[PDB]
Design a protein around this ligand. Structure first.
Ligand SMILES: Nc1nc(=O)c2ncn([C@@H]3O[C@@H]4CO[P@@](O)(=S)O[C@H]4[C@H]3O)c2[nH]1
Ligand SMILES: [Ca+2]
Length: 127
């Protein structure tokens, strides 16, 4: 959350894929977000895993890295920080993780799973 509801709304509204959603849907998404914490060096997403979660960074920074084959060391792609996001295609069921996302310091993310998201957006075309 209640205290953070408005903060969560601001984070959600800043994601371009979400910024046209009805206000009520964004409010309900804010209600179902979970906060998760990670330590420096922890993989938030591991390339090659299958997952169903999308992340918005509320604290800290992460390294996005990617390996071109399983036996090759990954290469650094970019840093993401507060207000940035990653993993969105998992909400559309594209569950194959295509890059690693690794905490570069203490990180907090707001996390939405596909089931919670589909429940809230799946009725828009009906209404
Ligand atoms: N492949 C890739 N190349 C990049 O340059 C890149 N920058 C950010 N990300 C994100 O890392 C996530 C990892 O999980 P997913 O594959 S479900 O989605 C991904 C993206 O959201 C990137 N991914
Ligand atoms: Ca914000």
């Amino acid at each position: 959350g209640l205290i953070k509801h408005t903060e969560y709304m601001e984070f959600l509204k800043s994601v371009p894929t979400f910024q046209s959603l009805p206000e009520e849907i964004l409010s309900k998404l804010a209600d179902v977000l979970e906060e998760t914490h990670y330590e420096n060096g922890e993989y938030i997403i591991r390339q090659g895993a299958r997952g169903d979660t999308f992340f918005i960074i509320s604290k800290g920074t992460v390294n996005v890295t990617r390996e071109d084959s399983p036996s090759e060391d990954p290469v650094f792609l970019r840093t993401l920080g507060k207000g940035d996001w990653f993993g969105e295609k998992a909400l559309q069921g594209e569950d194959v993780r295509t890059a690693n996302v690794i905490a570069a310091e203490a990180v907090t993310c707001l996390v939405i799973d596909r089931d919670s998201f589909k429940h809230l957006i799946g009725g828009l075309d009906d209404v």
